[PDB]
Amino acid sequence: SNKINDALNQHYKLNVELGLVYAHYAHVADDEFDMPYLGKFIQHLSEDKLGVHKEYISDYFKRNGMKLKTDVSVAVKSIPSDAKALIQEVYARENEVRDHVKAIAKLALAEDDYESFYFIQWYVRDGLKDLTEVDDVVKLFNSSNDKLIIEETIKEMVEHEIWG
Amino acid sequence: SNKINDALNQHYKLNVELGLVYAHYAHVADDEFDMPYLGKFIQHLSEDKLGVHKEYISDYFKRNGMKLKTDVSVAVKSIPSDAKALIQEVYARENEVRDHVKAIAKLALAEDDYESFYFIQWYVRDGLKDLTEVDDVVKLFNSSNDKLIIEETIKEMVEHEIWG
Amino acid sequence: SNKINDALNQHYKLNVELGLVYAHYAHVADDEFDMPYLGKFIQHLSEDKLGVHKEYISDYFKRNGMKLKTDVSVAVKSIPSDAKALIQEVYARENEVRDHVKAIAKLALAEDDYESFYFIQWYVRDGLKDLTEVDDVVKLFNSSNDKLIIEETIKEMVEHEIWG
Amino acid sequence: SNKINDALNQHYKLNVELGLVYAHYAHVADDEFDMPYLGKFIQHLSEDKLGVHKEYISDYFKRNGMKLKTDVSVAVKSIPSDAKALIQEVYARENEVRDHVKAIAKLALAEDDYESFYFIQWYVRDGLKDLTEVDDVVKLFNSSNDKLIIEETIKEMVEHEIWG
Amino acid sequence: SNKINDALNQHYKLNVELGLVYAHYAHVADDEFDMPYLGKFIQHLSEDKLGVHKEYISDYFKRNGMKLKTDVSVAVKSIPSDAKALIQEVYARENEVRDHVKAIAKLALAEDDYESFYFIQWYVRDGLKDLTEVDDVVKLFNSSNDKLIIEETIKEMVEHEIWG
Amino acid sequence: SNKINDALNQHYKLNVELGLVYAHYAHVADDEFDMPYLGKFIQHLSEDKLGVHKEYISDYFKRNGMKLKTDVSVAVKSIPSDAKALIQEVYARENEVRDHVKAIAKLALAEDDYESFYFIQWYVRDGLKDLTEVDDVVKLFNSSNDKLIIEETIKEMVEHEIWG
Numbered sequence A, B, C, D, E, F: 001s002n003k004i005n006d007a008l009n010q011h012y013k014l015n016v017e018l019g020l021v022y023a024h025y026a027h028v029a030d031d032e033f034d035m036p037y038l039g040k041f042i043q044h045l046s047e048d049k050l051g052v053h054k055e056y057i058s059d060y061f062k063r064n065g066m067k068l069k070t071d072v073s074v075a076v077k078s079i080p081s082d083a084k085a086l087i088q089e090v091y092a093r094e095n096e097v098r099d100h101v102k103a104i105a106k107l108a109l110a111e112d113d114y115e116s117f118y119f120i121q122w123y124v125r126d127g128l129k130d131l132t133e134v135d136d137v138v139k140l141f142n143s144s145n146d147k148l149i150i151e152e153t154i155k156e157m158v159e160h161e162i163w164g
Ligand SMILES: [Fe+3]
Pocket: A048, A049, A053, A126, A130
């Protein structure tokens, strides 16, 4: 399969670049907005993306006999101006990851690769999981105007049989 | 200090890009050369570079009041043809990291930043440590022709009061 | 070395006088501003300054063969009018301690006393540490208008491989 | 009560200044007289005076509604010439603290402050305790001419239901 | 670096020769002066010098790529006549080791070897430590005329966050 | 006995000089031949020679009333060119120590010193022990051409009721 190889290479690319952008966003949150726990939350996301999400693709390429490609071009030229705008940007990125994974699953099923539809089930599920736990934090900025209350709730968040 | 800020931004850049190149090299070693433990060794290096080596720079920039920049451009268009050539490439990269850190230390001392010379002592020491433990593996390919013996020695390597 | 002796005597003087001023400020915070945990924080600072920060200078003078001098003149004739102004005063004092220590380090290196540059590394590092943990509390008074929320955060604060 | 306020402010002043003088005397004992355990004894006295003896006065002023004043002027321009003369100086200072506390107790009883009498009982008792344990060490320099025997006895001292 | 290589070779030489001279001095103290614990103290010094103080130089030469040289010429043709003279000789030797290490540190900094200034910091500190603990025993022979009291104190000596 | 005194002084001399030569040989093995475990083996030999083998002679001289002499002149101007040649040199040195000890034992028995024949029995036995465990490693270089196999066997060696 060359179409599956191309799609999975693209997914690897996007995961690396999201990881780097999230690292920068966590620095900007902790430093410029005085919210260290929002920074720890975004940093947990960044480590998640730069770890197992590409570790698994490399392992699968070892097992099935496909080729790997590395091509990265990241740049951060503009940041949001609040913390609410920051977390809303994060939400949009996750929501786009969902559609990319859906396209991959459809492609895997259209060619009779049932081992590639089995692999992509993990990503199908983790997409909804991560989007849900990001919306959890998005919703707090609509419930309160006090930054310290929000930060205490996020601290408590930081420190399921189908999805979880 | 703007010179110190620029030098540390460049060091951040180089660390990210070395991490990505090492990830690709570990895949190529394990997959194309049938040496999984050489791959685990290079992957340990990659995680080292992509973790604390830039985590510390971001923390220091939080503490002292400097600015961060993110600009990454990595590409892998050619690989070595043996495993000895691979590990020798790794050795050259580490040896260049040494000179970059030495230049930073000299610059920190030339301006009377004694908190930035205190900071860069850690990197001054870890450079020699990492270069030494990479030369340890470089030397095995000159001691034996049997790939399985080398791989057993590397497995045993995988699983000091001044440097260590 | 007479220049090093004079510089270290001056540092001893300043440490004693900062300790006394911080004791008075902690009383004024707890009593006149109804913030007992801000008082506990400033009192921890005062004990820090009046303890090891001069204990170490006396020990070093025992070891290397220098002389000690005692000359103290402290007076508190005016206090701030809020708690934010109080903690900002504390921040300025710490920031001046930083420059004094930097001058001492430069002087130690200009004379070939490498045992006195080894000694002053501890102070070089503890300066940035203490300034950072004071700015942590400075920042809370810009995040909230409720005194009880701030006080709960400070209580939680009250009860690193390079700096910490 | 303004007379009680003035008397307690003066006691705070004297305690701070005795603490500083005792710190200098301990340095001079251990450095210039080769008796490190006499130095540790005098340093224990200094920490005692600079700690709870003024901590309690600040706490009482918090509780009863009095004002605090800070005004310190210490200088050490002349030291004794033996170790016996040093410890005899220490004895005289303690004996004067006794009379100051006695005057405070009389004043508290002359005005019908029975909460200031209850407070000063602690100092009434600790005066005799500290004077007794200082005379214990004063007496050794009349029992022996050998400095090492005296130092061993003091080391053993370093490492009651009414007074103690 | 050839100057650094030469300086470190000389330091290796001096350490070996001091170790041998201290072994002979410990024999002469225990046998000819009837002070076995002074002998144990000097023997501890000798083992210290003949162990890690040259073990570390050989390890560093393994790591950085320098050459080793061995050239030893020791002879003991005259000893002191008391035990005080013996320990004073020991004190002078340590005090000369201090100046040799200071010269090495200056040379390392004059050439931009910041890995050799990181290495020599250990010796910079251990010099003052060892000189202090030797002066501790030097001072006892001025406090007492009784050999058994001195010997008991030394026995008790035999059986810090900056220096220690 | 003056003949016994002279013989034991010579044995002390030879032990010190063998210790120093073995230290240099261990450095040369680990550094120039890429065999760290052969280096650890030779270093263990060096530590034995520089420790108890002369500790016991000094103790015996304390007990029986003989005199000590210190006269050392070591130099290393030429090394072997393989690792087999290195270990064969080590073997010859041990074999010569055997004959020296045999001569001492004969001399002790020729004069009716039965306390010096009781003393030299220990050396008579340890000679054969050390020669045997050195020949164990000598024999491996005739069994294999692979350096890593030899090194694994030596590692396993590194980590009797009559001799042992
Ligand atoms: Fe995830």
